[PDB]
Tab-separated table of C-alpha atoms in Angstrom:
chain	number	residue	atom	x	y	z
Y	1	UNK	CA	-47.580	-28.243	-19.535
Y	2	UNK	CA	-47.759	-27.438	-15.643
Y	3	UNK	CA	-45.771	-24.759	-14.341
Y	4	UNK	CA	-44.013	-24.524	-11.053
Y	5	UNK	CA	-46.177	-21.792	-9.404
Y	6	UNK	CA	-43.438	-20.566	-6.839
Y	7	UNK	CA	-41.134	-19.893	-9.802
Y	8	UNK	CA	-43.634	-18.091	-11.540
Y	9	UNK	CA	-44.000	-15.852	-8.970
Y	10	UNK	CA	-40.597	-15.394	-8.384
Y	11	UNK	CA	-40.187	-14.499	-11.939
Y	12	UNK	CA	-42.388	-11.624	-12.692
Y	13	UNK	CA	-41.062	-10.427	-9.508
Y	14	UNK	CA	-37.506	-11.090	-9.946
Y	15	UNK	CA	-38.363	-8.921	-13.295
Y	16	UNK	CA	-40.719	-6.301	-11.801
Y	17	UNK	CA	-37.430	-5.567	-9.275
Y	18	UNK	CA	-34.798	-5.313	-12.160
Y	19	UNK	CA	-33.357	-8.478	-10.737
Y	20	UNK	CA	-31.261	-11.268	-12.658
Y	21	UNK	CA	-34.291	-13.289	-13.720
Y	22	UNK	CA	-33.235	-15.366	-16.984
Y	23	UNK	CA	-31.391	-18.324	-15.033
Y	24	UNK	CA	-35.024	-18.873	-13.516
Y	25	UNK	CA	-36.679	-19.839	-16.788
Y	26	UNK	CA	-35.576	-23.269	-17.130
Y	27	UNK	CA	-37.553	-24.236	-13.833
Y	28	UNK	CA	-40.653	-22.503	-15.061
Y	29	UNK	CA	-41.944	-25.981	-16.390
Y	30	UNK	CA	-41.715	-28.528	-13.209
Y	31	UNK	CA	-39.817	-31.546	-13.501
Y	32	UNK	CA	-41.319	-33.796	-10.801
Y	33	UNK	CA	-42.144	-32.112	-8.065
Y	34	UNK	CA	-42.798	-28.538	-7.582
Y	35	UNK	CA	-40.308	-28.801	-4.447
Y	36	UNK	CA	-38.324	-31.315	-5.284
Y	37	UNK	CA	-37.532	-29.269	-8.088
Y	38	UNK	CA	-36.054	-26.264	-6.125
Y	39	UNK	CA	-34.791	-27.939	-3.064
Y	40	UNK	CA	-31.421	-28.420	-4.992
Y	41	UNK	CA	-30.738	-25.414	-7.421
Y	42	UNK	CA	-28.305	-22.770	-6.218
Y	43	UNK	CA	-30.583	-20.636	-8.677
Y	44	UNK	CA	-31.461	-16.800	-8.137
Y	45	UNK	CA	-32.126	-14.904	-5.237
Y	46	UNK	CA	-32.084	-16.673	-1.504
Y	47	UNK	CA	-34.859	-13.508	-1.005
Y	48	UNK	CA	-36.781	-15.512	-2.822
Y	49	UNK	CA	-35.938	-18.881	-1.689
Y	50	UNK	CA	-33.600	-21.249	-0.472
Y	51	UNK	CA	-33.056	-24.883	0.956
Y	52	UNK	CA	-33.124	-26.484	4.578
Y	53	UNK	CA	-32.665	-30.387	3.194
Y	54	UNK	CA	-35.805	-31.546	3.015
M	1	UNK	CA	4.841	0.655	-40.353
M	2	UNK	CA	4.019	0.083	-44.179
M	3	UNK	CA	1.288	2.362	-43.670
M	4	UNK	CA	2.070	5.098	-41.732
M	5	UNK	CA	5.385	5.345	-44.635
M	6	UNK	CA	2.092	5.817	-47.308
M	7	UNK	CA	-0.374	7.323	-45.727
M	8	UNK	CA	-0.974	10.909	-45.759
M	9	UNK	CA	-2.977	11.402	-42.695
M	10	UNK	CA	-0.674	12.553	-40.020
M	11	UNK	CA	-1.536	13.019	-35.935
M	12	UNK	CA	-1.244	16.112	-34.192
M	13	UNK	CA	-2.231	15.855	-30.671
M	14	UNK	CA	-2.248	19.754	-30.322
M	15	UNK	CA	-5.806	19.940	-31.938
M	16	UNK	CA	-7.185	19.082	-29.326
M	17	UNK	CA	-5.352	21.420	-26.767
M	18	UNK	CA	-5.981	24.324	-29.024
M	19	UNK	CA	-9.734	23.714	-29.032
M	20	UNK	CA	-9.927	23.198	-25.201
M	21	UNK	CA	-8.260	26.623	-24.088
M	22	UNK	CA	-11.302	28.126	-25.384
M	23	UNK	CA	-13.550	25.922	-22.815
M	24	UNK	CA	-15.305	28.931	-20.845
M	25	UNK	CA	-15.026	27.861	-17.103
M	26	UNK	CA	-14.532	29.545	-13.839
M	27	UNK	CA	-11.173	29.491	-11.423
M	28	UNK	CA	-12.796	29.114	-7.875
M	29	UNK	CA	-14.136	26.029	-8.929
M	30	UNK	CA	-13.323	22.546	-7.564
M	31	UNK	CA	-13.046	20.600	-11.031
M	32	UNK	CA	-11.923	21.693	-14.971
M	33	UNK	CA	-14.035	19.866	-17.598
M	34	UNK	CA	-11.590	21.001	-20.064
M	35	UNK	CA	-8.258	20.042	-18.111
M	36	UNK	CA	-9.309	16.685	-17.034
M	37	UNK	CA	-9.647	15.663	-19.881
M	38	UNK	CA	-6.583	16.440	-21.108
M	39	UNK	CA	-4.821	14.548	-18.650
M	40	UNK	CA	-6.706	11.679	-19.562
M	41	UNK	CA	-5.581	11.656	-22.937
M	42	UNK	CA	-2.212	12.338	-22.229
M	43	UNK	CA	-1.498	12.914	-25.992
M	44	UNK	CA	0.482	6.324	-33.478
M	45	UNK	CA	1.492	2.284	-33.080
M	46	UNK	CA	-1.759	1.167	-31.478
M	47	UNK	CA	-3.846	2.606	-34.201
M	48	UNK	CA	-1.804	1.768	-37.567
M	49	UNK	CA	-1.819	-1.885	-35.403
M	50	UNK	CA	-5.754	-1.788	-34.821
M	51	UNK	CA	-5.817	-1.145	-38.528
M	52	UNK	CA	-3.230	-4.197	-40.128
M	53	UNK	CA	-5.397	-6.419	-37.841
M	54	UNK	CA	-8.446	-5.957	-39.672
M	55	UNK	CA	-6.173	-8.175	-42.366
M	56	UNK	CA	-6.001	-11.102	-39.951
M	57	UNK	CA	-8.909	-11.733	-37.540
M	58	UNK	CA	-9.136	-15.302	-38.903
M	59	UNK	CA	-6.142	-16.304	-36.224
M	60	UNK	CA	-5.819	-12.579	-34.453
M	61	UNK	CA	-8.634	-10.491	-32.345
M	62	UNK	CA	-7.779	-7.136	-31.443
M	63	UNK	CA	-9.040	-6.063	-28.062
M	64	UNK	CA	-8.949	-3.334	-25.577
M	65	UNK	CA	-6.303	-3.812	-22.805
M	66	UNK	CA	-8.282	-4.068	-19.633
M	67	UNK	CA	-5.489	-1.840	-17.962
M	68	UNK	CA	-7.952	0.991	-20.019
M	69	UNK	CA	-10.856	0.261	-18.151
M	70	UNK	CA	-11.535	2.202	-14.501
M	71	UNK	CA	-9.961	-0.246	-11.681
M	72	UNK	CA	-13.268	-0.737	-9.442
M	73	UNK	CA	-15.808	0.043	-12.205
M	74	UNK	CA	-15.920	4.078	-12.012
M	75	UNK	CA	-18.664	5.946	-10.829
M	76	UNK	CA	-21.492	8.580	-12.752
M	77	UNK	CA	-20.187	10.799	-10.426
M	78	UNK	CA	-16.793	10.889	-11.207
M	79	UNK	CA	-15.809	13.327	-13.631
M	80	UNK	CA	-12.882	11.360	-14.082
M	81	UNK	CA	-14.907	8.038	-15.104
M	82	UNK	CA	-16.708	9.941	-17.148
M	83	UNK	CA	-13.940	10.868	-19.683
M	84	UNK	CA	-13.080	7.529	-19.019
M	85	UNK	CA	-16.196	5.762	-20.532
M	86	UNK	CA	-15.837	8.486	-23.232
M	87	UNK	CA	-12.422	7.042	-24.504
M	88	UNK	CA	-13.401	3.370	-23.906
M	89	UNK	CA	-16.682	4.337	-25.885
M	90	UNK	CA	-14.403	6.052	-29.322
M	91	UNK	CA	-12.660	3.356	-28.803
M	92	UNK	CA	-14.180	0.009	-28.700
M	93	UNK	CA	-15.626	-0.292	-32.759
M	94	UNK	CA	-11.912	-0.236	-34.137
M	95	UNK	CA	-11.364	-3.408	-32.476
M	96	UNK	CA	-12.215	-7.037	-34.086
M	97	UNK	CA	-13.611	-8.331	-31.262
M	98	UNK	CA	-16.919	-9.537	-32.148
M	99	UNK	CA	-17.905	-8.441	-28.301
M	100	UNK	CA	-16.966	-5.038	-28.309
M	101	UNK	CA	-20.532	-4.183	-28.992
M	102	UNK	CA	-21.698	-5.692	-25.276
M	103	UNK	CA	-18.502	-3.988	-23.559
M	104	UNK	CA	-19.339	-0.552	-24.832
M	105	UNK	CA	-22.376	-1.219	-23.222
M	106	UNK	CA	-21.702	-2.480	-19.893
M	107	UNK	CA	-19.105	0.056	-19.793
M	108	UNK	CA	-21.341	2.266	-18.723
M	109	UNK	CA	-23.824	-0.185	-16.775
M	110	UNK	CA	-20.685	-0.555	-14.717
M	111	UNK	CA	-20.644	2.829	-13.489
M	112	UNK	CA	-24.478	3.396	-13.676
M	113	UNK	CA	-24.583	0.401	-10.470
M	114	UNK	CA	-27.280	2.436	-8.278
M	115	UNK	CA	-28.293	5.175	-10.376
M	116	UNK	CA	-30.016	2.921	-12.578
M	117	UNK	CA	-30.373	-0.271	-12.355
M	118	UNK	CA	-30.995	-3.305	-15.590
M	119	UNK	CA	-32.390	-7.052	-15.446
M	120	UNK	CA	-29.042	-9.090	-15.625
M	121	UNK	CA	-28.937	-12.464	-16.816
M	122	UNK	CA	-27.819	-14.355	-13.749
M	123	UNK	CA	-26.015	-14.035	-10.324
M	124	UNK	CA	-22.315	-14.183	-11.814
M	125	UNK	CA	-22.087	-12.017	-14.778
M	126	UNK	CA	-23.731	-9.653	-12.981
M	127	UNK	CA	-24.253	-5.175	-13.240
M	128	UNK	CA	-21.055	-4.936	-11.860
M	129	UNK	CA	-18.826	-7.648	-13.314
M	130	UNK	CA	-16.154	-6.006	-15.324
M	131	UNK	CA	-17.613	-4.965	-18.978
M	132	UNK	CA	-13.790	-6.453	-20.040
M	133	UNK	CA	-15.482	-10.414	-18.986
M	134	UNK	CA	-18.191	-10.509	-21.600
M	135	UNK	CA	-15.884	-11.812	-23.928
M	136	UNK	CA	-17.811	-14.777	-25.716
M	137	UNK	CA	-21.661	-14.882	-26.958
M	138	UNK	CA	-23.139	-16.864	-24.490
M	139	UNK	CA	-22.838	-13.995	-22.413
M	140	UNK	CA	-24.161	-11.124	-23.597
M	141	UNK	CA	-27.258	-10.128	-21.838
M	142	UNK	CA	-30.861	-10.840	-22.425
M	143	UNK	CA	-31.539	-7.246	-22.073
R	1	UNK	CA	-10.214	-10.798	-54.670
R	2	UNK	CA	-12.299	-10.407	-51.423
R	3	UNK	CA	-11.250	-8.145	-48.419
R	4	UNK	CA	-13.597	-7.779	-45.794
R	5	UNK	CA	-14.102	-4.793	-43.366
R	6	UNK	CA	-15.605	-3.903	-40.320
R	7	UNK	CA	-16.366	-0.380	-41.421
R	8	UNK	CA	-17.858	1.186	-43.854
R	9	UNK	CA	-16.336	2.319	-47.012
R	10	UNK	CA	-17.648	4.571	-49.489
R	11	UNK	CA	-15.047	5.813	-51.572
R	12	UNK	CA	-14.447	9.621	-52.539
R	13	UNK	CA	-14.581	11.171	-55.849
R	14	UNK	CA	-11.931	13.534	-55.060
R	15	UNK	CA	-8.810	14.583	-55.010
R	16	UNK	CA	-8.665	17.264	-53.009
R	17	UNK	CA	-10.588	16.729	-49.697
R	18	UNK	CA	-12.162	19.304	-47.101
R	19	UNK	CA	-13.233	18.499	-43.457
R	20	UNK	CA	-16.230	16.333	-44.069
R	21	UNK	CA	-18.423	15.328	-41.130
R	22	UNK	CA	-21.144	12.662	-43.210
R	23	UNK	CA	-18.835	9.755	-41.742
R	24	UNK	CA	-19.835	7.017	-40.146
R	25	UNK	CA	-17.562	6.941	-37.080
R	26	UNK	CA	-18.298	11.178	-36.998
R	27	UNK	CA	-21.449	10.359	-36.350
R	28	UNK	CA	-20.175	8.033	-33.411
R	29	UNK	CA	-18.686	10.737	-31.917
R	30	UNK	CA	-21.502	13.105	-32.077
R	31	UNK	CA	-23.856	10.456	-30.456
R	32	UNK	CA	-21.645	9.309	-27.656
R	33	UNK	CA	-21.457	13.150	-26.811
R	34	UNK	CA	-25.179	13.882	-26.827
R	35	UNK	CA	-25.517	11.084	-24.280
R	36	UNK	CA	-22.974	12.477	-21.994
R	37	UNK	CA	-24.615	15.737	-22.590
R	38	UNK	CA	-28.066	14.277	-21.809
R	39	UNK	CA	-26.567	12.395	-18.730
R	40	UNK	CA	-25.560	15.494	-17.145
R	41	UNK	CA	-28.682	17.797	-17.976
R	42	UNK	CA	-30.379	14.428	-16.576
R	43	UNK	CA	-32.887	16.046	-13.990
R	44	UNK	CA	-31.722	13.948	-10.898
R	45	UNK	CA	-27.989	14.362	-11.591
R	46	UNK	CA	-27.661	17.789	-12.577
R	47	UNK	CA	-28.663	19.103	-8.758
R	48	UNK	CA	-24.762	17.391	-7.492
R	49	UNK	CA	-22.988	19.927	-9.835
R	50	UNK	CA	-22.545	23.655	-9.018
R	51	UNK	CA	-24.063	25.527	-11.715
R	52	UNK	CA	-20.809	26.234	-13.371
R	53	UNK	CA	-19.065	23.303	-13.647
R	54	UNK	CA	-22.277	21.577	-15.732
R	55	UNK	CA	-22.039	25.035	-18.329
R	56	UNK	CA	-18.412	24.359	-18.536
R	57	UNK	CA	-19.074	20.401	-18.901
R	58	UNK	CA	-21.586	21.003	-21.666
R	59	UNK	CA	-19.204	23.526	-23.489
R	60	UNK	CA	-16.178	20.928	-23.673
R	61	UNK	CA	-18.404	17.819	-25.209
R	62	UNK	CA	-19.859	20.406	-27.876
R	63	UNK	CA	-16.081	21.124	-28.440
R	64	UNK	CA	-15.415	17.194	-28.823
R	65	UNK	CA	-17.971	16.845	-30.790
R	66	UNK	CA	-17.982	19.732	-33.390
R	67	UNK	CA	-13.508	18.992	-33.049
R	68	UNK	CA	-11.999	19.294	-36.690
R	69	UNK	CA	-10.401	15.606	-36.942
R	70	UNK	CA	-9.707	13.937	-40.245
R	71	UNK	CA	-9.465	10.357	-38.973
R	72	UNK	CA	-13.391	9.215	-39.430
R	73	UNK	CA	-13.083	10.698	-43.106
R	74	UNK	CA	-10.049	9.239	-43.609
R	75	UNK	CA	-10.982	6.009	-42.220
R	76	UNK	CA	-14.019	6.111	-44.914
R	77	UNK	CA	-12.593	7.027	-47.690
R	78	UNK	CA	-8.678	6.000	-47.977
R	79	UNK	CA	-7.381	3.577	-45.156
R	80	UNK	CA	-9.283	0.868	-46.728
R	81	UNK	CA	-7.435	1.830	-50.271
R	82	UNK	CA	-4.259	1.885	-48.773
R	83	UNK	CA	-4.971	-1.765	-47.025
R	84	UNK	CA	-6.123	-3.318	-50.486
R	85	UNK	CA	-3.329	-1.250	-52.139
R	86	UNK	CA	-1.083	-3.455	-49.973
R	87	UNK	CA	-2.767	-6.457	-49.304
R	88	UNK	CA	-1.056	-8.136	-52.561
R	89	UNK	CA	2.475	-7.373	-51.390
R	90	UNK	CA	2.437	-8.741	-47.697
R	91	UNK	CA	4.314	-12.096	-47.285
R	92	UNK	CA	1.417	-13.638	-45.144
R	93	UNK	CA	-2.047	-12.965	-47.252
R	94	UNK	CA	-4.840	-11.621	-45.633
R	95	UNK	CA	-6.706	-14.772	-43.968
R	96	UNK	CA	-10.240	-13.317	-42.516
R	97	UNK	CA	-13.480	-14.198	-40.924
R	98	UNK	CA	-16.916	-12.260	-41.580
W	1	UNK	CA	-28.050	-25.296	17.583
W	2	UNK	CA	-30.158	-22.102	16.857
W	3	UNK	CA	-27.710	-18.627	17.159
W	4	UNK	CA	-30.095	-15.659	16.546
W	5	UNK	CA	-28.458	-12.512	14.796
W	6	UNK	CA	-30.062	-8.973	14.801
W	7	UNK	CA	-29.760	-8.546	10.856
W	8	UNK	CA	-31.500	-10.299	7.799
W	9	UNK	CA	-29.086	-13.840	6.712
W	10	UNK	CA	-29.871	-14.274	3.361
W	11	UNK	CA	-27.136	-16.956	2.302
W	12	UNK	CA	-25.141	-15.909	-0.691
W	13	UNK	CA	-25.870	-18.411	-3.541
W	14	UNK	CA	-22.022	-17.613	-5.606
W	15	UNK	CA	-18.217	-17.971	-5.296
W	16	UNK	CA	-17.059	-15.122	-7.118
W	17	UNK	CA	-19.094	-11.880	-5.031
W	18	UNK	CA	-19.284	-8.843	-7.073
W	19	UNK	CA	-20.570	-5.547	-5.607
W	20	UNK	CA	-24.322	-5.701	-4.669
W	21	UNK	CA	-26.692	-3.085	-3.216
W	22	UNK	CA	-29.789	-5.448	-2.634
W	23	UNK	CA	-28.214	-5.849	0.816
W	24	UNK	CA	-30.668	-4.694	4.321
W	25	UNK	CA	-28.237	-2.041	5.487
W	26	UNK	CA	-27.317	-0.620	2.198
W	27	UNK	CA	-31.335	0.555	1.585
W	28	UNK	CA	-30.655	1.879	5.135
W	29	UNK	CA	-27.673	4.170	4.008
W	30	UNK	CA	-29.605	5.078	1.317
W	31	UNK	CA	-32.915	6.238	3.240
W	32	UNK	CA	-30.890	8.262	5.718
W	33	UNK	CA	-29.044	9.803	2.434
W	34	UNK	CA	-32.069	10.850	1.100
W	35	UNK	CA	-33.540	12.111	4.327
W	36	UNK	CA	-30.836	14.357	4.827
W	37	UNK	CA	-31.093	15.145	0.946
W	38	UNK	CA	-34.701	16.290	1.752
W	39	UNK	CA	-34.315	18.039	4.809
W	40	UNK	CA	-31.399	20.611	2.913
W	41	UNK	CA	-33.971	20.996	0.016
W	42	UNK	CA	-36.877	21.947	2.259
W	43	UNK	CA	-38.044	25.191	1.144
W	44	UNK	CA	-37.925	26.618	4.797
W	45	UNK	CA	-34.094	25.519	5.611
W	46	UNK	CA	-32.819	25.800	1.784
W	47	UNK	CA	-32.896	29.640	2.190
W	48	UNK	CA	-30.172	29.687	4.630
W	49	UNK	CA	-27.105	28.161	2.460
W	50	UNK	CA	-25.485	29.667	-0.773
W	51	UNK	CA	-26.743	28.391	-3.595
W	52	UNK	CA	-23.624	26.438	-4.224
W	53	UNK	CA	-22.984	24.971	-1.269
W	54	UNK	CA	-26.538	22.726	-1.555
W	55	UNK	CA	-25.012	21.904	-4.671
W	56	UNK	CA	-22.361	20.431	-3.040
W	57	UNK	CA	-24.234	18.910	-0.104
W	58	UNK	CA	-26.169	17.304	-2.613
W	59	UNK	CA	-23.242	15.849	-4.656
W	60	UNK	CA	-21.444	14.775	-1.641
W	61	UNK	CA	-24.361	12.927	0.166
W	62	UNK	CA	-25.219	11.049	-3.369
W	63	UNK	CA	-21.726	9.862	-3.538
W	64	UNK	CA	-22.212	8.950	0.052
W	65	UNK	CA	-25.127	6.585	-1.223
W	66	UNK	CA	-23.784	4.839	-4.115
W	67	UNK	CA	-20.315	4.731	-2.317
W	68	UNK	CA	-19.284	1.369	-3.138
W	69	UNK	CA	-18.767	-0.840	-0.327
W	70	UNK	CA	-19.002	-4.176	0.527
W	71	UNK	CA	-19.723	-4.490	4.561
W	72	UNK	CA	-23.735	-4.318	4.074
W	73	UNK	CA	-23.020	-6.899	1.680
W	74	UNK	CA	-20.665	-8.893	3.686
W	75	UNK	CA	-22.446	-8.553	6.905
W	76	UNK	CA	-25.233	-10.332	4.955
W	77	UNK	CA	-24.110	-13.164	3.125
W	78	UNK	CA	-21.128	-14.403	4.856
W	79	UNK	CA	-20.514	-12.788	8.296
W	80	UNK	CA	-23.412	-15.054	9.762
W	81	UNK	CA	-21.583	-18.192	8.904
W	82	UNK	CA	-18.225	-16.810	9.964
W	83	UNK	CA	-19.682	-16.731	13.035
W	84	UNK	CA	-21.755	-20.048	12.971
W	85	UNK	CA	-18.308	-22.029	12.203
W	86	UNK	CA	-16.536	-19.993	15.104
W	87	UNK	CA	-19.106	-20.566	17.742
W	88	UNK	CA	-18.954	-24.420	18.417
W	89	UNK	CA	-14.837	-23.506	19.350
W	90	UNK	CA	-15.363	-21.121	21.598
W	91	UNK	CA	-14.817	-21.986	25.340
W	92	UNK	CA	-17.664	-19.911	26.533
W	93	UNK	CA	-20.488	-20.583	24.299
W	94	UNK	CA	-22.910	-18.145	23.472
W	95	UNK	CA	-25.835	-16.867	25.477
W	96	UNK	CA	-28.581	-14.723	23.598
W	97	UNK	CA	-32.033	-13.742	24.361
W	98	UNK	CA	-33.989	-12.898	21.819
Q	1	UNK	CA	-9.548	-11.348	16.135
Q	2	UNK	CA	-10.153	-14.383	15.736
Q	3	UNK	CA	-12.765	-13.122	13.177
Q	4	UNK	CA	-10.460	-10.821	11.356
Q	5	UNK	CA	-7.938	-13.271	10.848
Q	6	UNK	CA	-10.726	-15.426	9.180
Q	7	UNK	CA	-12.510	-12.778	7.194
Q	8	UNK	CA	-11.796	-11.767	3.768
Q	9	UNK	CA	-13.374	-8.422	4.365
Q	10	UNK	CA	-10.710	-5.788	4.579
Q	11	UNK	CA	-11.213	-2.162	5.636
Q	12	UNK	CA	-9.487	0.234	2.997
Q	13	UNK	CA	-10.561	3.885	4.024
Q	14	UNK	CA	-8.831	4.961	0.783
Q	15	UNK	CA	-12.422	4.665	-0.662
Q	16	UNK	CA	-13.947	7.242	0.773
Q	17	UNK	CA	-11.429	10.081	0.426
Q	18	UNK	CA	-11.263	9.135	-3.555
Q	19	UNK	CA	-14.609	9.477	-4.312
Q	20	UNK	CA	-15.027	12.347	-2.016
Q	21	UNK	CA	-12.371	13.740	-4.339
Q	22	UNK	CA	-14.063	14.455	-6.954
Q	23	UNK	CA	-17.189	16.345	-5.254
Q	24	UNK	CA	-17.937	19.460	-7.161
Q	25	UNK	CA	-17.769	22.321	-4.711
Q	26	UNK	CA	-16.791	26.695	-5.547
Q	27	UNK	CA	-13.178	27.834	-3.464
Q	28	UNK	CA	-14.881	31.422	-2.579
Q	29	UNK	CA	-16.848	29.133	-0.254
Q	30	UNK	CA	-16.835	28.789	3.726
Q	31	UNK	CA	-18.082	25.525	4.204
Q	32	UNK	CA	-16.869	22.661	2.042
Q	33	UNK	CA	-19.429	18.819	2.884
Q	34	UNK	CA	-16.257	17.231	1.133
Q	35	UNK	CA	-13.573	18.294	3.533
Q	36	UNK	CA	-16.182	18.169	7.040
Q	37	UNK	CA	-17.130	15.069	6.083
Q	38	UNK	CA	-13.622	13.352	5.936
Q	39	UNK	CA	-12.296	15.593	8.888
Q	40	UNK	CA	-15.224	13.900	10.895
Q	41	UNK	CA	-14.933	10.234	10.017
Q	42	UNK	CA	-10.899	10.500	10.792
Q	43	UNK	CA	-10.146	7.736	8.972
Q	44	UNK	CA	-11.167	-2.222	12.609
Q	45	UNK	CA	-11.346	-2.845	16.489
């Protein structure tokens, strides 16, 4: 299966930090797009990432 | 009631006030181990009750009133949190709460917020969220 | 004929007890006291007490934990008598969940 | 539409805040805790104070660190839209340079 | 004010003087960080 590469970085390094990291897993596999994917989540950290729309 | 009429074990608070005016300490300073502590037990029905609801968790759970845990969380460095977690801690495993286990724990995590710091599972039930929340399964922690 | 409990019981073979610390809640105690113990001895903590107050705190946990209570013993060996002792009598039955 | 701000905005992603220390001005109490930590325990300046009072100094200035307050937090999560949903109402409308 | 009519952040100074309450410190000392510190942050606009 094809993982969603800017989750998986956000994981080992929501982990390395001692962060809440679990509620990232079930984005680890990507859906349809490896955007798409995140643009609508209200997921982890906004360090890590957040959403402008598009 | 029924028990405390048959059994022969008896409470007497005084134990521990005897043992604690032998606590070596000095007088110039600031805070008294051995006082504190005291006043924090303040020293029956809760515990014969704890007991007779060991006989009825199929409709009753026993659990600790969250008026017993510290108001903002308590802090490592407050002696006073300290005894705090120590009675919550004694506590806890005579309740039937199936989640006492994961409130003993973040108890503590609670007051450790800073000192040391654990992977949480998600942005709400979070280090600092009350230990009294984890209530049901789905919550307790990964870690 | 089934009462469960979320302790462990291991009944005595005596009749006339003596302070007994090989309980299972004693050993609770003991535990939850070392870690308080270990918690202020902790290298990076110990510094924010004056010297005293940390000989003093150490003193009053090994009190707690060496205290002569009956309870855990009791609570091993007798409460759960007493409960089955009564258990037939009650007007509501017992009505549990493992 | 752009309104610059002279802190990190890292929109908060919750409904139900709960004390957090991952905040840009709360590492910044924390560093100038520690540097003052540091400069009492330097072996050239350490000499000069009882042995109790670092003690102290110490204790105090950790629970100056892990003090729990929410500003730092506040100032980054929602402050910035407080003031994004004021400015279109103001009558003078704000002027920044960068 | 306009802000602090809108924002849920409230200033309660109580904070600091309760965990500075419980600092360990000796009486047979001259200086106390405890007390200084509090006496200098007498504790908004």
């Amino acid at each position: 299966e094809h993982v969603n590469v800017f989750v998986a970085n956000a994981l080992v390094g929501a982990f390395l930090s001692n962060q809440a990291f679990y509620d990232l897993l079930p984005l680890l596999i990507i859906n349809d797009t490896m955007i798409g994917d995140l643009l609508g989540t209200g997921a982890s950290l906004s360090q890590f990432f957040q959403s402008h729309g598009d | 009631v029924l028990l405390q009429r048959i059994s022969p074990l008896q409470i007497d608070p005084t134990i521990i006030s005897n043992t604690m005016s032998t606590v070596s300490e000095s007088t110039t300073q600031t805070l008294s181990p051995a006082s504190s502590i005291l006043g924090k037990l303040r020293p029956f029905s809760s515990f014969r009750v704890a007991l007779a609801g060991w006989l009825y968790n199929g409709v009753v759970t026993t659990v600790i009133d969250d008026s017993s845990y510290p108001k903002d969380g308590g802090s490592v460095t407050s002696l006073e949190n300290l005894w705090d977690f120590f009675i919550l801690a004694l506590a806890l495993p005579l309740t039937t709460d199936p989640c006492a286990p994961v409130k003993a724990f973040m108890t503590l995590a609670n007051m450790m917020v800073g000192f040391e710091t654990i992977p949480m599972d998600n942005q709400i039930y979070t280090q600092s969220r009350r230990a009294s929340a984890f209530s049901t399964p789905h919550t307790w922690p990964r870690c | 004929e089934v009462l469960l409990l979320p302790i462990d019981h291991q009944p005595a073979n005596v009749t006339t007890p003596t302070l007994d610390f090989t309980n299972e809640l004693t050993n609770w105690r003991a535990r939850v006291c070392e870690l308080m113990k270990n918690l202020v001895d902790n290298q990076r903590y110990q510094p924010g007490w004056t010297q005293s107050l940390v000989s003093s705190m150490r003193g009053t946990l090994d009190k707690l934990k060496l205290i002569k209570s009956m309870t855990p013993m009791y609570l091993q060996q007798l409460a759960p008598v007493e409960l089955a002792v009564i258990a037939p009598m009650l007007p509501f039955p017992p009505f549990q969940v493992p």
